[PDB]
Amino acid sequence: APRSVDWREKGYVTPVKNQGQCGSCWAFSATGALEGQMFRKTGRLISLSEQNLVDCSGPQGNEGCNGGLMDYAFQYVQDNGGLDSEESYPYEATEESCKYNPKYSVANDTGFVDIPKQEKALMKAVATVGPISVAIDAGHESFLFYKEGIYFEPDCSSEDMDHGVLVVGYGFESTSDNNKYWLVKNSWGEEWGMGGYVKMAKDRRNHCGIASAASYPTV
Numbered sequence: 001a002p003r004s005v006d007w008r009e010k011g012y013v014t015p016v017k018n019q020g021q022c023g024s025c026w027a028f029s030a031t032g033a034l035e036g037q038m039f040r041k042t043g044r045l046i047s048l049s050e051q052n053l054v055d056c057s058g059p060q061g062n063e064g065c066n067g068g069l070m071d072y073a074f075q076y077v078q079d080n081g082g083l084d085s086e087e088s089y090p091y092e093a094t095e096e097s098c099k100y101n102p103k104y105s106v107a108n109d110t111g112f113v114d115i116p117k118q119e120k121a122l123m124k125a126v127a128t129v130g131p132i133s134v135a136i137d138a139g140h141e142s143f144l145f146y147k148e149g150i151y152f153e154p155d156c157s158s159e160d161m162d163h164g165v166l167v168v169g170y171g172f173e174s175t176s177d178n179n180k181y182w183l184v185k186n187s188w189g190e191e192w193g194m195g196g197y198v199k200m201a202k203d204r205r206n207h208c209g210i211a212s213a214a215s216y217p218t219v
């Protein structure tokens with residue numbers, strides 16, 4: 001794999017979004033991954049509707065503003081035959097009745113891939129596929145108040161993840177001893193972290209469980 005990857009530079013990544021008070025992180029992680037795979041497929045970067053996922057993917061096991069799984073979202077898109085654009089089905093940050101309209105479907109998927117649970121497998125996936133949906137342990141105050149640089153939290157769990165985010169690349173800082181990072185897009189708006197991103201510790205024993213539940217949709 002290359003030493004550094006950043007899919008933002010290749011046009012695969014929409015601007016940072018804000019989920020608000022709704023427990024819809026999983027929906028933002030899923031749309032991020034699908035936005036990337038749709039761009040690879042078609043050359044068109046189109047922002048997708050998290051609201052459509054929040055309102056409509058109960059049958060697949062998602063729980064709206066009270067949590068869900070990226071893979072359940074990918075299964076919904078396959079079952080449903082599509083997913084609306086953000087423009088057509090805008091984000092409300094509350095769970096409402098399903099308003100899916102196939103006329104405005106701009107994405108599809110044919111399933112999903114679960115990546116082996118190693119950072120080396122995650123790097124290979126990121127290098128070759130595009131942005132990847134990942135689960136992390138975000139449940140430390142150090143994450144809430146993260147501002148810049150490489151995020152490392154000694155008490156992070158590699159097994160107890162509670163937040164879905166999107167890996168858009170990886171790289172290394174030239175500063176000192178521990179310099180590698182995953183580039184991670186969050187859904188807490190641009191005023192959190194580094195314009196809404198967190199450079200997360202890479203190759204330090206699967207820190208925060210970033211390689212523990214990584215996946216992406218096939219299109």
Ligand SMILES: *C(=N)C1(NC(=O)[C@@H]2C[C@@H](S(=O)(=O)c3ccccc3Cl)CN2C(=O)C2(c3ccc(Cl)cc3)CC2)CC1
Nearest residue numbers: 023024025026061062063067068135161162163164213
């Ligand atoms: C996001 N605003 C909130 N977090 C979740 O909804 C997270 C997302 C995923 S995860 O990425 O943590 C994860 C964890 C373990 C294994 C795979 C994955 Cl993808 C699940 N989330 C959860 O909070 C849990 C969950 C799981 C399944 C359902 Cl239907 C609801 C909730 C508790 C694991 C909401 C804060």
